[PDB]
Amino acid sequence: PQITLWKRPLVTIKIGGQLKEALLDTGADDTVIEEMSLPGRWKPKMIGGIGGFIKVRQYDQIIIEIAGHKAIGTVVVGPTPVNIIGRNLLTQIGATLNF
Amino acid sequence: PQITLWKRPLVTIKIGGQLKEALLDTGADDTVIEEMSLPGRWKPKMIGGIGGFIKVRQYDQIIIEIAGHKAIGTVVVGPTPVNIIGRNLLTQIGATLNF
Numbered sequence: 001p002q003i004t005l006w007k008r009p010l011v012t013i014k015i016g017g018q019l020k021e022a023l024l025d026t027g028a029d030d031t032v033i034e035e036m037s038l039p040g041r042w043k044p045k046m047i048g049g050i051g052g053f054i055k056v057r058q059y060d061q062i063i064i065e066i067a068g069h070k071a072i073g074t075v076v077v078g079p080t081p082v083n084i085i086g087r088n089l090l091t092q093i094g095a096t097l098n099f
Numbered sequence: 100p101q102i103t104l105w106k107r108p109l110v111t112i113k114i115g116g117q118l119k120e121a122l123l124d125t126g127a128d129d130t131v132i133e134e135m136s137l138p139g140r141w142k143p144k145m146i147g148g149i150g151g152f153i154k155v156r157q158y159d160q161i162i163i164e165i166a167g168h169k170a171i172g173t174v175v176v177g178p179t180p181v182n183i184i185g186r187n188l189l190t191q192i193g194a195t196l197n198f
């Protein structure tokens with residue numbers, strides 16, 4: 001699709017067998033999802049941005065279907081105010097900014 | 100242009116006669132810049148990022164160039180770690196996310 005930016009670019013994603021709404025976020029390096037279970041090993045890390053830092057659990061090789069497009073990569077899980085699809089997965093679905 | 104996302108979508112902007120680096124961010128509702136002087140009166144606003152909310156100064160009808168594209172609109176100033184071009188100005192310059 002071609003998504004205009006009058007509203008937040010929210011899409012449905014499928015992760016860990018669950019449907020979630022998430023923000024397509026060119027300003028995010030990483031994909032950050034609210035608390036959920038994911039399989040496999042994980043490693044803690046901190047993410048800091050506007051407002052300060054939160055602690056997240058990093059899971060590797062997680063598949064996510066984003067608006068119908070499959071991608072695999074690292075997903076971090078933690079107390080984010082909004083589910084965020086960041087550049088590590090936007091590249092995989094071929095998303096670009098155009099103007 | 101068409102900007103891929105393998106690296107951060109950083110561009111040069113011009114505001115108050117000065118060049119600065121900023122992030123094109125589809126996950127930001129508004130445009131927030133690091134501390135600088137802008138003309139006119141400002142209004143209070145808060146913006147929420149990954150770690151909580153910050154207070155910013157909202158200036159309206161500010162002249163700003165984004166990657167060579169002229170715009171006039173709302174710019175907020177505050178303690179952001181990175182200059183952010185958000186959806187208000189991305190929409191004005193015709194940007195869309197495509198995949």
Ligand SMILES: Cc1cccc(C)c1OCC(=O)N[C@@H](Cc1ccccc1)[C@@H](O)C[C@H](Cc1ccccc1)NC(=O)[C@H](C(C)C)N1CCCNC1=O
Nearest residue numbers: 027028029030048049050126127128129146147148149180
């Ligand atoms: C939501 C909003 C409303 C009004 C105005 C603004 C600017 C708004 O956006 C605020 C905001 O922080 N939006 C984020 C996503 C957002 C929207 C709504 C709520 C919470 C978050 C995101 O897009 C941009 C922001 C930029 C950033 C800031 C400081 C340092 C580095 C980068 N990016 C990050 O925080 C990312 C996180 C998400 C992995 N990040 C931080 C670790 C280093 N690298 C990195 O990429």
Ligand SMILES: [Cl-]
Nearest residue numbers: 072073074088
């Ligand atoms: Cl990844």
Ligand SMILES: [Cl-]
Nearest residue numbers: 091094103104
């Ligand atoms: Cl590509």
Ligand SMILES: [Cl-]
Nearest residue numbers: 172173187188
């Ligand atoms: Cl505006």
Ligand code: NA
Nearest residue numbers: 040059060061
């Ligand atoms: Na894993």
